[PDB]
mmCIF file of C-alpha atoms and ligand atoms in Angstrom:
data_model
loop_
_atom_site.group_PDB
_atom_site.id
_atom_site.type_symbol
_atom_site.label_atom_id
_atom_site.label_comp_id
_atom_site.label_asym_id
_atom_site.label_seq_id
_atom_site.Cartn_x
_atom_site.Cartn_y
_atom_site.Cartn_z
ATOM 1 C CA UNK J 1 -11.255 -14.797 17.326
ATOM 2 C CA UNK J 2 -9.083 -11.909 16.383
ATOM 3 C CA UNK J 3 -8.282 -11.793 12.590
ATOM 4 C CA UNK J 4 -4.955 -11.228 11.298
ATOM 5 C CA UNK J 5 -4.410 -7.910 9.501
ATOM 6 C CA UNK J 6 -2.154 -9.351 7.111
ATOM 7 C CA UNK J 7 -3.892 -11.926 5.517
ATOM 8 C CA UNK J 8 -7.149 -11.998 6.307
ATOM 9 C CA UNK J 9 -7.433 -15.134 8.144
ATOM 10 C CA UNK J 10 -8.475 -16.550 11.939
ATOM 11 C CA UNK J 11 -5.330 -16.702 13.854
ATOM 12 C CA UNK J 12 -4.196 -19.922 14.870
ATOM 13 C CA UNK J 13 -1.180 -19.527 16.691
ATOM 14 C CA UNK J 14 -0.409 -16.760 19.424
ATOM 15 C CA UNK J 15 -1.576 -12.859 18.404
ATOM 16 C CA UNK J 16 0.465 -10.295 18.007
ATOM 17 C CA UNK J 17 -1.778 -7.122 19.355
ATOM 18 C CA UNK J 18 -0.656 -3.647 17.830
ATOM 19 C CA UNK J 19 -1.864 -0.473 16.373
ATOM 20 C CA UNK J 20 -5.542 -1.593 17.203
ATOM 21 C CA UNK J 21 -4.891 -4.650 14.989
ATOM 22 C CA UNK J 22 -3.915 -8.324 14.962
ATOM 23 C CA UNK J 23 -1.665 -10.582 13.277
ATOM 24 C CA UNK J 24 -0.005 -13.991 12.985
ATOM 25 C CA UNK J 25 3.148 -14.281 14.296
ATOM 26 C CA UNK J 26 4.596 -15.048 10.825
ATOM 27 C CA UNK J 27 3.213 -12.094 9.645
ATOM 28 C CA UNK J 28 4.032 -9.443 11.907
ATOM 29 C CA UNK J 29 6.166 -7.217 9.265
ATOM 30 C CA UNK J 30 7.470 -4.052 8.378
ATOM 31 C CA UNK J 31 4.507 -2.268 6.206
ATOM 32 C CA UNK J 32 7.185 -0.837 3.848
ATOM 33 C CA UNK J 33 9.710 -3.208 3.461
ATOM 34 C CA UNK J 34 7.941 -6.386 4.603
ATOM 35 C CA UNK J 35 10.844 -7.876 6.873
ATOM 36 C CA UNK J 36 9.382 -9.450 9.651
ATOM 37 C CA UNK J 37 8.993 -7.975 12.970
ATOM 38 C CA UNK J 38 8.377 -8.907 16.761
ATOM 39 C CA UNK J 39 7.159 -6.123 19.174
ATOM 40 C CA UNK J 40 10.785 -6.394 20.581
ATOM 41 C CA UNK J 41 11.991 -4.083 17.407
ATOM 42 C CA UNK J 42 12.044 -0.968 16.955
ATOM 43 C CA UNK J 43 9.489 0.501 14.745
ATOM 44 C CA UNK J 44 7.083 3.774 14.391
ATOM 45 C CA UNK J 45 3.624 3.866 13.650
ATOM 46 C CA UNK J 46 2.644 5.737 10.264
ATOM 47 C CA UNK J 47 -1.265 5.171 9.665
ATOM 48 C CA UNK J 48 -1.420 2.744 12.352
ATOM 49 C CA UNK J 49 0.950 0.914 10.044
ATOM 50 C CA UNK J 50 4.179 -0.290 11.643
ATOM 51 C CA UNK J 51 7.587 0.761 9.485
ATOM 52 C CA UNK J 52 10.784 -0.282 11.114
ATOM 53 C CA UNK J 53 13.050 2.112 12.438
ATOM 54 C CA UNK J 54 15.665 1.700 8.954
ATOM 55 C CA UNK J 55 12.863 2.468 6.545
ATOM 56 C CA UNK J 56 11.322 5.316 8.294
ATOM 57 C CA UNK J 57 14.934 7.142 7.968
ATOM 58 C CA UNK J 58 14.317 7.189 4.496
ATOM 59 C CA UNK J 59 11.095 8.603 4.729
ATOM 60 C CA UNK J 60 11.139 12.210 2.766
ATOM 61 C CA UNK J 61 12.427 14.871 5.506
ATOM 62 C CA UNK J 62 9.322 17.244 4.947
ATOM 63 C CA UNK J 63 7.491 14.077 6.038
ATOM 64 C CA UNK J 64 9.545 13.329 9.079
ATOM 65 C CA UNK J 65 9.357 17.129 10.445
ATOM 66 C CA UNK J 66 5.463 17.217 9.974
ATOM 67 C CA UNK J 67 4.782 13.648 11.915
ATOM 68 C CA UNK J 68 7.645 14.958 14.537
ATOM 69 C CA UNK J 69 5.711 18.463 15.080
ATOM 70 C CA UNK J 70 2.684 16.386 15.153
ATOM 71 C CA UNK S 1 23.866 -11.778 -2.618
ATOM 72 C CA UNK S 2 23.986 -10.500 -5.998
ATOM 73 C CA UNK S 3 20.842 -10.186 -7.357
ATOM 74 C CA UNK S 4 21.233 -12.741 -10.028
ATOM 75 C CA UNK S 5 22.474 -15.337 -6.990
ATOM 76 C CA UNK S 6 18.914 -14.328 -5.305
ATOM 77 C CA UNK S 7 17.333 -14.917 -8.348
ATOM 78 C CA UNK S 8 18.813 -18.405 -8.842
ATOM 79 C CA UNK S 9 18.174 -19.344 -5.423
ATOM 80 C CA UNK S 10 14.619 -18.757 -5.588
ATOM 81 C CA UNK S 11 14.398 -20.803 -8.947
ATOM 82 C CA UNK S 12 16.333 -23.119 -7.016
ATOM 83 C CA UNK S 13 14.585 -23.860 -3.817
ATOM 84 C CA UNK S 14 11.928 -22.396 -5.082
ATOM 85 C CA UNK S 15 11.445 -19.833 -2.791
ATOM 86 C CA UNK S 16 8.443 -18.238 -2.838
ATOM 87 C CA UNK S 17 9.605 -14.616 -1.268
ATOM 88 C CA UNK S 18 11.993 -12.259 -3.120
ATOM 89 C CA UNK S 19 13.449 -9.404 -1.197
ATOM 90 C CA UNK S 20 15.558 -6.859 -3.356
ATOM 91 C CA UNK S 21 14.898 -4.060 -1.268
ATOM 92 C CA UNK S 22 17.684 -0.942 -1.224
ATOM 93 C CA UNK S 23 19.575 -2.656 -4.053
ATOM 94 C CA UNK S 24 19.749 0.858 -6.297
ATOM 95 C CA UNK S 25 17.722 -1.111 -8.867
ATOM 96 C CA UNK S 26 16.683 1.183 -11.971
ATOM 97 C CA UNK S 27 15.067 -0.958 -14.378
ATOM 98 C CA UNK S 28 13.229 -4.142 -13.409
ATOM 99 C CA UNK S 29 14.452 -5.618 -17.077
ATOM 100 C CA UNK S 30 17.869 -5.459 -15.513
ATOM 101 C CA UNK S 31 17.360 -7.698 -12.581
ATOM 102 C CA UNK S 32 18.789 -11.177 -14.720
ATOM 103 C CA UNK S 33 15.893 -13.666 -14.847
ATOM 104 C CA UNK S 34 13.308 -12.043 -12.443
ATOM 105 C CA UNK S 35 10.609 -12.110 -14.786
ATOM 106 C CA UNK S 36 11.253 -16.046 -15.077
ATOM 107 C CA UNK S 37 10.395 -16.459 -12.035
ATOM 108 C CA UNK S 38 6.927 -17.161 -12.335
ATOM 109 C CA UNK S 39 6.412 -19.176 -8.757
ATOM 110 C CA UNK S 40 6.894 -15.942 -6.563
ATOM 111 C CA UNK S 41 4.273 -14.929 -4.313
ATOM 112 C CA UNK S 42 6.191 -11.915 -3.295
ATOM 113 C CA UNK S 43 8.332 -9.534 -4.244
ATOM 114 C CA UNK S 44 9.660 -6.842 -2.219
ATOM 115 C CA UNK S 45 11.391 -3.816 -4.303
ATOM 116 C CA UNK S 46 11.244 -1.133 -1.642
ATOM 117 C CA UNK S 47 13.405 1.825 -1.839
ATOM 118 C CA UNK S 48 15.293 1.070 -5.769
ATOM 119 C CA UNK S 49 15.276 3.594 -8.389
ATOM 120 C CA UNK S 50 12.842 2.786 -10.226
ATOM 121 C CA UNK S 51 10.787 5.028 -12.776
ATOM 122 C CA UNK S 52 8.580 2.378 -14.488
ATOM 123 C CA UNK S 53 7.519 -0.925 -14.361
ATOM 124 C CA UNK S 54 7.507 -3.237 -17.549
ATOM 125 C CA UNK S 55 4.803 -4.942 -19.109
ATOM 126 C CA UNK S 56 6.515 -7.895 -17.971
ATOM 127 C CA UNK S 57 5.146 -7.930 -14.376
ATOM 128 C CA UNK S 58 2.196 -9.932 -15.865
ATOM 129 C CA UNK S 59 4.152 -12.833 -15.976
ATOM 130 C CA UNK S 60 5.029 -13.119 -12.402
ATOM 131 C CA UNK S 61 1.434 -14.541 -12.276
ATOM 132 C CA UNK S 62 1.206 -16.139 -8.732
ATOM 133 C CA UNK S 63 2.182 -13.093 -7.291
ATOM 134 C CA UNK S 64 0.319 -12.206 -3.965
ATOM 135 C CA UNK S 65 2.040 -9.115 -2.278
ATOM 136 C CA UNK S 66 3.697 -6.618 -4.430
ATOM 137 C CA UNK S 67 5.962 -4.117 -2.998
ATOM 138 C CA UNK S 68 7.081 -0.735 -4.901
ATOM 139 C CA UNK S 69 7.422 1.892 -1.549
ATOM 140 C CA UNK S 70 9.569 4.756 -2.021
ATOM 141 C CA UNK S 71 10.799 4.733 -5.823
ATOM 142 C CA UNK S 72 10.592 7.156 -8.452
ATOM 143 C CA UNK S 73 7.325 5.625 -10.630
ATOM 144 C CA UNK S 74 5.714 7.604 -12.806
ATOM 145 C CA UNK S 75 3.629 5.415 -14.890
ATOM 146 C CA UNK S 76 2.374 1.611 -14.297
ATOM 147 C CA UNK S 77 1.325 -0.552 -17.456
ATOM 148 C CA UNK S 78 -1.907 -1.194 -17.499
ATOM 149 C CA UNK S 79 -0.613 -5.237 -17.418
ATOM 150 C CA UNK S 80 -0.477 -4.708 -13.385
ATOM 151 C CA UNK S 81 -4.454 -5.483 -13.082
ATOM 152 C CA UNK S 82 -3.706 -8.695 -14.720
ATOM 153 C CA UNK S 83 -2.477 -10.253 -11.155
ATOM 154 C CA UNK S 84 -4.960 -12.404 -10.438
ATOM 155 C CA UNK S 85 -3.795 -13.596 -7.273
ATOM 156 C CA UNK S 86 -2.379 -10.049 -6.216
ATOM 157 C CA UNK S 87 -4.141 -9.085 -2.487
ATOM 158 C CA UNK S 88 -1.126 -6.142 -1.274
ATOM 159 C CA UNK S 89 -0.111 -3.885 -3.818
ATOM 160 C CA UNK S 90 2.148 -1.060 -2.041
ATOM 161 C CA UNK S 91 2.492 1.839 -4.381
ATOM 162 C CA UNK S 92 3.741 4.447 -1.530
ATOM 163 C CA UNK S 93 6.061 7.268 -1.871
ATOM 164 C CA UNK S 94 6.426 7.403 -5.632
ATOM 165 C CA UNK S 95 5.430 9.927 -8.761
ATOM 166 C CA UNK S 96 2.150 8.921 -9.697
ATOM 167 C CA UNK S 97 -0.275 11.287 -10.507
ATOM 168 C CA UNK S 98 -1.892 8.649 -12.603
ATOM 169 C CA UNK S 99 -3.328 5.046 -12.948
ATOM 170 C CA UNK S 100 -3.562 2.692 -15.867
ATOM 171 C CA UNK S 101 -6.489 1.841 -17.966
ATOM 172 C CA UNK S 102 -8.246 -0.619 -16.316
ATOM 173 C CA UNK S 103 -6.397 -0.691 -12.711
ATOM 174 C CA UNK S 104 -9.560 -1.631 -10.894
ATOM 175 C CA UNK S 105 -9.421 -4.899 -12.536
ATOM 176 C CA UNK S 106 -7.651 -6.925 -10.058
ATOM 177 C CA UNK S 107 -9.860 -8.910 -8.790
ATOM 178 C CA UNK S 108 -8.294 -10.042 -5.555
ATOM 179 C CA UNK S 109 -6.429 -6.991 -3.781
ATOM 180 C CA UNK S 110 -7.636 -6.486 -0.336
ATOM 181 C CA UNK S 111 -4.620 -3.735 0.648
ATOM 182 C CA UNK S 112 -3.550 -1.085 -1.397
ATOM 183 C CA UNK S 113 -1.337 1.623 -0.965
ATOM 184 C CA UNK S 114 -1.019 4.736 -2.822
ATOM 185 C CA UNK S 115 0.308 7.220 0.033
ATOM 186 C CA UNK S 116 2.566 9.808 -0.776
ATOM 187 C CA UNK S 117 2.210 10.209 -4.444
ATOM 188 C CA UNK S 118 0.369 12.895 -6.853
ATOM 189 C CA UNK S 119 -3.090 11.638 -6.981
ATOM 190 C CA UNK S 120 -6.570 13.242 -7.043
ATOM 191 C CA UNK S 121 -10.093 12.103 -7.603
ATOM 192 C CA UNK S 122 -9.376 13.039 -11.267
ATOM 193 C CA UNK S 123 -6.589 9.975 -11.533
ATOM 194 C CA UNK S 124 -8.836 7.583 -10.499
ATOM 195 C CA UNK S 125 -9.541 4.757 -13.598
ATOM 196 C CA UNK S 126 -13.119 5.018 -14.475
ATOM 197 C CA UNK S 127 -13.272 1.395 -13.273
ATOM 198 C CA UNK S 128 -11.489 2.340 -9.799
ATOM 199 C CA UNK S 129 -14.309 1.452 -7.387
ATOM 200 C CA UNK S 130 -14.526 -2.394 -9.121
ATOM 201 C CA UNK S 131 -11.855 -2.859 -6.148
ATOM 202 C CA UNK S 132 -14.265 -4.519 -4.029
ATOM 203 C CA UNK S 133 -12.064 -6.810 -2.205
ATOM 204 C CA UNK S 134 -10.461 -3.833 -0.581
ATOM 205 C CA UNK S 135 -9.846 -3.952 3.002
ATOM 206 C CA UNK S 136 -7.596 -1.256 3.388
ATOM 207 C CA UNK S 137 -6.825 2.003 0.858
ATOM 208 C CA UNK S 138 -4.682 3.885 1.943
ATOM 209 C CA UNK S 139 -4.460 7.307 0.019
ATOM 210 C CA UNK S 140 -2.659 10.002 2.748
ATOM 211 C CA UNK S 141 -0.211 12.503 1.376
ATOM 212 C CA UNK S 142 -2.050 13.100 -1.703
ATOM 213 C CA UNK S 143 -4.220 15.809 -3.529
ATOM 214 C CA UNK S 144 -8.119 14.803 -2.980
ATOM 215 C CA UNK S 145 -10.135 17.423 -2.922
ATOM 216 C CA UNK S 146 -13.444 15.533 -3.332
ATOM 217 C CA UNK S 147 -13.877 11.953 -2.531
ATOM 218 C CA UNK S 148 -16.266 9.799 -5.412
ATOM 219 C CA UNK S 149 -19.692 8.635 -3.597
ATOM 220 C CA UNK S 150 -18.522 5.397 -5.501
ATOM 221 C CA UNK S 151 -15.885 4.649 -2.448
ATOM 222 C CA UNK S 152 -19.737 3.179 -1.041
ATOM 223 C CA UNK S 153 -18.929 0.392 -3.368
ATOM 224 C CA UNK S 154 -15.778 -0.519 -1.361
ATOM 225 C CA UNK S 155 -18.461 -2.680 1.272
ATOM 226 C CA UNK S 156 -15.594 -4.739 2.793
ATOM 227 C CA UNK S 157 -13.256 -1.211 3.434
ATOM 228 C CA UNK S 158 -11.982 -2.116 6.912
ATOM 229 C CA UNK S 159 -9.587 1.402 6.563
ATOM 230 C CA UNK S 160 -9.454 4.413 5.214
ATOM 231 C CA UNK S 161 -6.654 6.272 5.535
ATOM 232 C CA UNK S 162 -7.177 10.337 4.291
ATOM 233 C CA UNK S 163 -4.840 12.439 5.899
ATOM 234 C CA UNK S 164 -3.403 15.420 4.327
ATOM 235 C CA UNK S 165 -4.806 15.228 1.087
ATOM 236 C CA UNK S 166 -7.434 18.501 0.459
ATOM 237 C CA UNK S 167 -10.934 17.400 0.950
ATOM 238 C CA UNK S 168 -13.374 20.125 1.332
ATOM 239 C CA UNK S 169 -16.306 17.973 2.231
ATOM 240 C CA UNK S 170 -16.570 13.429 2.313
ATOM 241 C CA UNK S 171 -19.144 11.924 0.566
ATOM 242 C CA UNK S 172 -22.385 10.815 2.476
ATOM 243 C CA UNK S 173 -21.648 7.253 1.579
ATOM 244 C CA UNK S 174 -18.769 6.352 3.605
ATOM 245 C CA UNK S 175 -21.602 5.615 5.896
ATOM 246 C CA UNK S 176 -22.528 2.696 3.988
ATOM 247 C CA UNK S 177 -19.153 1.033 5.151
ATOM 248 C CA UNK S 178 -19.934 -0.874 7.685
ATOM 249 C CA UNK S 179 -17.359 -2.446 8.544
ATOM 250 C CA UNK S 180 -14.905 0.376 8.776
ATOM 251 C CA UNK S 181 -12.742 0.392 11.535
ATOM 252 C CA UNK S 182 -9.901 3.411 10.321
ATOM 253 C CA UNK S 183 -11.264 6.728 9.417
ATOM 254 C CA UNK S 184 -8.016 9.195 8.886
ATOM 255 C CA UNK S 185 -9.155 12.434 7.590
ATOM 256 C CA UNK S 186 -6.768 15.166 9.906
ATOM 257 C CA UNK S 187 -4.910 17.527 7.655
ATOM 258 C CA UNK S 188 -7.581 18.116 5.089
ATOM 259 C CA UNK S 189 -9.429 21.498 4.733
ATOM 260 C CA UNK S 190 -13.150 20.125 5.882
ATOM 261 C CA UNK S 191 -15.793 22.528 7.492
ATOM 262 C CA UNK S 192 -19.060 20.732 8.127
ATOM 263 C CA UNK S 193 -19.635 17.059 6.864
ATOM 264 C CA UNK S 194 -23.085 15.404 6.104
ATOM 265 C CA UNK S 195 -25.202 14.311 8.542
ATOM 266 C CA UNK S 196 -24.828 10.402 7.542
ATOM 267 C CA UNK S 197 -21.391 10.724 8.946
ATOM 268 C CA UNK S 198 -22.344 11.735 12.225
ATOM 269 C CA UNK S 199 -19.830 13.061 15.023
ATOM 270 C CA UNK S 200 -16.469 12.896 13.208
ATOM 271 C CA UNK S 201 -13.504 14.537 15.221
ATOM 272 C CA UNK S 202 -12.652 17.070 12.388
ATOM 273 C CA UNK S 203 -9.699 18.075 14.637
ATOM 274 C CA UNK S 204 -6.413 18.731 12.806
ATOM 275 C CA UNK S 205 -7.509 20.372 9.894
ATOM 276 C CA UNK S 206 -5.365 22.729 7.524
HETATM 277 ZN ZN1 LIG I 301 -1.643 -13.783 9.205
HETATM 278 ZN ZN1 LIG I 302 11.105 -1.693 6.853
#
């Protein structure tokens, strides 16, 4: 009965469990640049959001060193 | 592709998805026939050069998820709350330290994303908390010092997401959320919280 994060509906096919969410298999995506993702790729959580690994290296370097430290 | 092949494609097979992401775009009236495209349910503009957005996003009516992370935006026309169909609106990582007249008109968003920008309670639209769709709001990085007791409005707010802004104190009424899942309020400067809010960890505070 788990509800996909993304949008917002029951889902059907097989869950994809991350970040202490669900979604669709279709809808499993990069937060920030919306390409689609698998739990195979690489990617880093940022507010229990996943961003894949090529837009988090654009993330502001004051921002990487804090969530490093962190 | 070139971006005006991308934009013929879509128009072509009528593809509802448009990804221009990292494409050093700096002026949405320059992407040739983008605002014709009036099918689109998304369109992903992630990491461009952007400083504004036109007046002409109201035409891409059937949009659904709207993608802006990590420009330069300093001002949205007021036009962007006329999406009717809009439900993710990511607004990360730009230069807003305000909203438009009117933003909390969109009547179907159910994830928005303003993290990383310039915002306090005081660039809120009066009509902010008319959201009440939202799901998720996601406001980190950001310079709150007091949050409005109108986010108890937000009844369907499955996430909040508060970290590092400057809250002294939350109001009582993020109780009233019942369905909130996501509480992230480390990096703030909070001391003692109401009661209604019960045990919060207030561990990682600045
Ligand atoms: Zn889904
Ligand atoms: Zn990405």
């Amino acid at each position: 009965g788990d509800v996909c994060f993304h949008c917002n509906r029951v889902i059907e096919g097989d869950v994809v469990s991350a970040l202490n969410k669900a979604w669709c298999v279709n809808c499993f995506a990069c937060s920030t640049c919306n390409t689609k993702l698998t739990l195979k790729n690489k990617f880093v959580e940022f507010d229990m959001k996943p961003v894949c690994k090529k837009c988090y290296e654009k993330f502001p370097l004051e921002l990487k060193k804090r969530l490093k430290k962190l | 592709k070139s971006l005006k092949k991308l934009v013929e494609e879509s128009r072509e097979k009528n593809q509802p998805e448009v990804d221009m992401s990292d494409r050093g775009i700096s002026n949405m009236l320059d992407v040739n026939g983008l605002f014709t495209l009036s099918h689109i349910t998304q369109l992903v503009l992630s990491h461009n050069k952007l400083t504004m957005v036109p007046p002409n996003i109201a035409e891409l009516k059937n949009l659904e998820v709207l993608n802006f992370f990590n420009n330069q935006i300093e001002e949205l026309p007021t036009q962007i709350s006329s999406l009717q169909k809009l439900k993710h609106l990511n607004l990360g990582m730009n230069r807003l330290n305000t909203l438009p007249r009117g933003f909390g008109s969109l009547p179907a968003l159910e994830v928005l994303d303003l993290t990383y920008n310039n915002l306090s309670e005081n660039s809120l639209p009066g009509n902010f908390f008319y959201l009440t769709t939202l799901r998720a709001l996601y406001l980190s990085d950001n310079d709150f010092e007091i949050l409005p007791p109108d986010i108890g409005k937000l009844t369907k707010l499955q996430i909040l997401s508060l970290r590092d802004n400057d809250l002294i104190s939350l109001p009582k009424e993020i109780g009233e959320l019942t369905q909130l899942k996501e509480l992230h309020i480390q990096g703030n400067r909070l001391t003692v919280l109401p009661p209604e809010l019960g045990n919060l960890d207030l561990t990682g505070q600045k």
